[model samples]
Target chain A: MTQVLRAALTDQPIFLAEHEELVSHRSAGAIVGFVGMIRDRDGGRGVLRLEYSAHPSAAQVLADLVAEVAEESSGVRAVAASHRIGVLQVGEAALVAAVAADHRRAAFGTCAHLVETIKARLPVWKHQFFEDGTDEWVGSV
Target chain B: MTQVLRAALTDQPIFLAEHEELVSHRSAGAIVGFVGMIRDRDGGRGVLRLEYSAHPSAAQVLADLVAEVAEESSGVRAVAASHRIGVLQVGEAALVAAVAADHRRAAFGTCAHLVETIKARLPVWKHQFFEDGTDEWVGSV
Candidate 1:
């Protein structure tokens, strides 16, 4: 049975270690994880920094989504995810998701699906500052 | 361009942190990783311990495999992998693989493919001891 251990948005730095630990169990043979980072460049432009803004309901939505994935994915022992809110510099982690399963395929599939679902459903926007003295808002619908 | 930072068969404990660090770069926007562990159960049987034995050429083969994956994978910035060869208790990591890319899809796909390839090609065998006092060798040619 799959269990959702951690799911929330945080202002503090989130490392993969914590999420990995949260999903690991004695029954799990494989663990797969994805980390989204603030890259130095985007669309051929040098990125200076990024600030993430989330709706007040973002945490609850993320938690619900995690629970849904956990319920849907078979063979998953555990799942954990966290998205970092606030300003982030280049190479800093913005989001992290992990899944533990009895097999590698299940772990990889569940983790990937969870990340994709979060990207599609999460109500979050990115304010990006570029080195060319320009800025833009992404996913601000 | 993708670079293979680390690849080898070691008797020491393999960690996701070292592989994550090795694959991390400022240009990478996504990092994906998979860790294989010694589970407490297999095929409904309780497992007590596991011993991994690698051929002398296993390290060279793994290095070549990592280099091949790095060259073939587009958008990947770096890749690292290490497989532990020795006795491992339940919950201990047996293999760790990580990939960094400009996007999540590429990172996830390449990391998953690399692991599958390693399992298919690596000349390694597992000696598994069950709680019921039966033992067997797996993947031995």
Candidate 2:
């Protein structure tokens, strides 16, 4: 995440490399990115497709999470991350995050923090369209 | 750095994104990458350019390091890292490393480990050219 913080829902494969490149600079030595893809199956559940539903504040939530990662992590230079919504098939990316730091450890830790924060706090729901014509919902109360 | 490991010396910018994309898969949820760039200055010296010299075994050493990162880190799915040699101008990438994993923490940690291992164990020499029309050698005994 450079000076520009990225946190949004899209109908596309998260361009993780673009974000990584954005955060990359001369002073930054390490940058880590995460791409959470739609796997073929989940916990023995055959996944045909999955849809993500987001609240209005989803972007704000992501921005806060990215900011927190930068503030808490030592020597952070930049941060960028995003989560994708809408219907997606297996093998597509649903979430992506990246962080740049002065050292490798800080970058790794901060990047992990950003991702965990998104999953834990962001109001994004997962609706699974499973094989055998079955379905289920996740992150929905 | 999965079963496929990339180790090479080049006179070009290390294409970390290409490697990142290659290692990215539907199963991986995290990817961490590090880029070592030639800063404008170093040791208070206005840097001009730098050149890296590698032994014949440099590639093998890098491959081994990549393998170790994948083998030692938990939940690692892929590893791809590289170090560039030959003449390079300021702000150019000198080294690049990336990893993908089932979890963000593992990818972050393994990527950091890979970068550290390269610094500690890889046999690559650096020749730094300063703007003061002087130069110095590093890691050369």
Candidate 3:
């Protein structure tokens, strides 16, 4: 299956290098990748763990986002992103977005834009367990 | 021998995961990485091979660059970079840089800035052999 300009939800470990390889077509000289992980704290509150649950249509939402990004950006050659669900501890990858382009300017900009769009649009709910035993669900805005 | 926020010139293959691991501190939430490779063709000419020869001070130049990037960015937690010198074939990795930060914006910006500075300042010479039995030397600007 072609992973280029594709999106999915998986439980597999996210590898930045692998994403780079997927987008490393010789036509593209620059590859940029961003990995968002579960931080130890959130909003100054200590986070013990995180549990992400995606809506049933989360995959489709991601697919459409990537498709639109690739279509609109003329310089972008490829884009790929994946969001992880299930229990995650500190430092585990939560989201990965990457892009490749003919130059660093476009590659970096596209990769960053992909990440922001994913964070804002992905239908994934984050449940954070705090150190004080309080837990709350944070929905995508 | 810590590669974290340090630079080196090596014949060994550069792995993105190693750089990610080096900068993956518990306090950082975002990781941004960039990879530059030898394209199959440049300027409408087919590329056969590449040879990168760096000045003896290239390693130190990279080291200073990484250090300065980490120190100057308040949100940045760590930085790491490496450049490969010696014979490389088309599509092989040539340079890699990564940064960890408290947020995606800073991480992405810092990583890109590091790469541009390296390309502008790093004293490495590129000798490219073309398919038509001709070769040319390219230097940092």
Instruction: Using DockQ, give the best candidate's number.
Output: 1
Could you tell me how far off, in angstroms, the CA of residue A92 lies in candidate 1 after the best superposition? 0.9
TM-scores vs. true structure, each candidate = 0.97, 0.87, 0.92
* Regions of model 2 farther than 4 Å from truth: A139-141, B139-141
> What lDDT tens digits, residue by residue, belong to model 2 across residues A26-103?
766566676777766667777889988889988788787777767776778888887888988887778877777766
List of chain A TM-scores, every candidate: 0.96, 0.90, 0.90
Report the C-alpha lDDT of model 1 over A34-63, residue by residue, as the tens digit. Answer: 999999998899999999999999999999
Stretches of candidate 1 off by over 4 Å are: none
Q: If both were scored by lDDT, which would come out higher, candidate 1 or candidate 3?
A: 1
lDDT of 3 by residue, A44-95 (tens): 8898988888899998898988877777786777888888888888789999
- Candidate 3 CAPRI-style tier: medium
Per-candidate interface DockQ score: 0.92, 0.51, 0.77
Interface RMSD of each: 0.6, 2.4, 1.0
Judging by DockQ, tell me the better candidate of 1 and 3: 1
